[PDB]
């Protein structure tokens, strides 16, 4: 299995990256240093994660150390919902660049299709509870993203949590200058995403699978929720291949032509999660894992279900 996938901007993207949502600021610098030392070349970041400065300390140390060259890293970040405003997009990108200690991003994503009222709060609320939207058309946010490419701040632009009608709207944008390179979406055996993945791939958009292990550290986890890592059917496939359940869960999206971004702050697991290029799941294994689909979502942005652009009312 090749390590990189070709994007529609002509650049190559590592199919395995390190996730950083929930990685504590006092742990993520070591996590990213270890990741780069054991082979990771792709880090998935976001301003809303509140840890980009600490991720950046690690990246900069490894560049200064000459453990890696900048051209060999693939750093991804995302535009938060409170920065949809065309006049805030550049400053949001530049703050992320400054925090990450970078002069460009390899990929910058619109984090969600939903724009929120700008301000200090990431989830600005009305007195009665709901997300206060912004009025900025997401085609206009896309144009602002295109300007970042034309200014040299980012090499590629893309989207995240867009449903197929929303992807289509971008593809059909009057005057579209750059297609999205990537759509980053939740994907794992309980949310297999066949319909949306086929759509994106037919349009030459690469899909990145987030929460591939089912996000056991998500802050709203409950006892009775289904657990990928503990599912005896998945552990059986792992046992047959002499791999861990996490390794099967990471290899699965790789064999669907997806990029995958498991998160860990545990050095042994970071190294574990990378040793997935030495085995193959059979077609029968792949179809069996696909059969576990339950339409079960980790990340449903539940405060935003009446936003006009909430993505998950549509089938796909
Ligand atoms: N675009 C979006 O809206 C969006 C949404 C969600 C996620 N993401 C991205 O996708 C990344 C991954 O998703 P996620 O963080 O939700 O969850 P995940 O990667 O599915 O699961 C992370 C959890 O699995 C544990 N873990 C990692 N490797 C393990 C292993 N080998 N064995 C057992 N447990 C293991 C981690 O523990 P330790 O860390 O304690 O080792 C952590 O609790 C995020 O960090 C973020 O970068 C993006
Ligand atoms: N509730 C949700 O679905 C999202 C998920 C999400 N995780 C992620 O990586 N992207 C997200 O937007 C997240 C991250 C945060 F830092 C804060 C909130 C939050 O909520
Ligand atoms: Cl963000």
Swiss-Prot record:
Keyword Electron transport: yes or no? no
Question: Sorted alphabetically, which PROSITE patterns does this protein's record hold?
Answer: ALDOKETO_REDUCTASE_1 (PS00798), ALDOKETO_REDUCTASE_2 (PS00062), ALDOKETO_REDUCTASE_3 (PS00063)
Q: Return the GO cellular component terms, semicolon-separated.
A: cytosol; extracellular exosome; extracellular space; mitochondrion; nucleoplasm
Say which enzyme class the record assigns.
oxidoreductase
Q: For binding substrate, which residues are annotated in this chain's numbering?
A: 111
N-acetylalanine occurs at 2
Q: What is its main location?
A: cytoplasm
**Where N6-acetyllysine occurs along the chain?**
95, 222, 263
Q: Where does NADP(+) bind?
A: 10-19, 211-273
Which Enzyme Commission number(s) are on file for it?
Answer: 1.1.1.21, 1.1.1.300, 1.1.1.372, 1.1.1.54
How would you summarize its activity regulation? Cys-299 may regulate the kinetic and inhibition properties of the enzyme, but does not participate in catalysis. Tolrestat inhibits retinal reduction.
- Any idea which residues bear Phosphoserine here? 3
Specify the effect of residue 111 to N.
Answer: Reduced glyceraldehyde oxidoreductase activity
> What tissue specificity does the UniProt entry give?
Highly expressed in embryonic epithelial cells (EUE) in response to osmotic stress.
* Pfam families associated with the record: Aldo_ket_red
Site, Lowers pKa of active site Tyr: residue positions: 78
Q: Name one GO biological process term.
A: doxorubicin metabolic process
Give the active-site positions. Answer: 49 (proton donor)
The cross-references to InterPro entries, in alphabetical order and at most eight, read: AKR, Aldo/ket_reductase_CS, NADP_OxRdtase_dom, NADP_OxRdtase_dom_sf
Q: Where in the cell is it found?
A: Cytoplasm
Q: Which reaction does it catalyse?
A: an alditol + NADP(+) = an aldose + NADPH + H(+); all-trans-retinol + NADP(+) = all-trans-retinal + NADPH + H(+); 9-cis-retinol + NADP(+) = 9-cis-retinal + NADPH + H(+); 13-cis-retinol + NADP(+) = 13-cis-retinal + NADPH + H(+)
What is an example of a GO molecular function annotated in this UniProt entry? L-glucuronate reductase activity
Q: Describe its assembly.
A: Monomer.
Q: Which family does it belong to?
A: Belongs to the aldo/keto reductase family.
The entry's function note states: Catalyzes the NADPH-dependent reduction of a wide variety of carbonyl-containing compounds to their corresponding alcohols. Displays enzymatic activity towards endogenous metabolites such as aromatic and aliphatic aldehydes, ketones, monosacharides, bile acids and xenobiotics substrates. Key enzyme in the polyol pathway, catalyzes reduction of glucose to sorbitol during hyperglycemia. Reduces steroids and their derivatives and prostaglandins. Displays low enzymatic activity toward all-trans-retinal, 9-cis-retinal, and 13-cis-retinal.
Protein name listed in UniProt: Aldo-keto reductase family 1 member B1
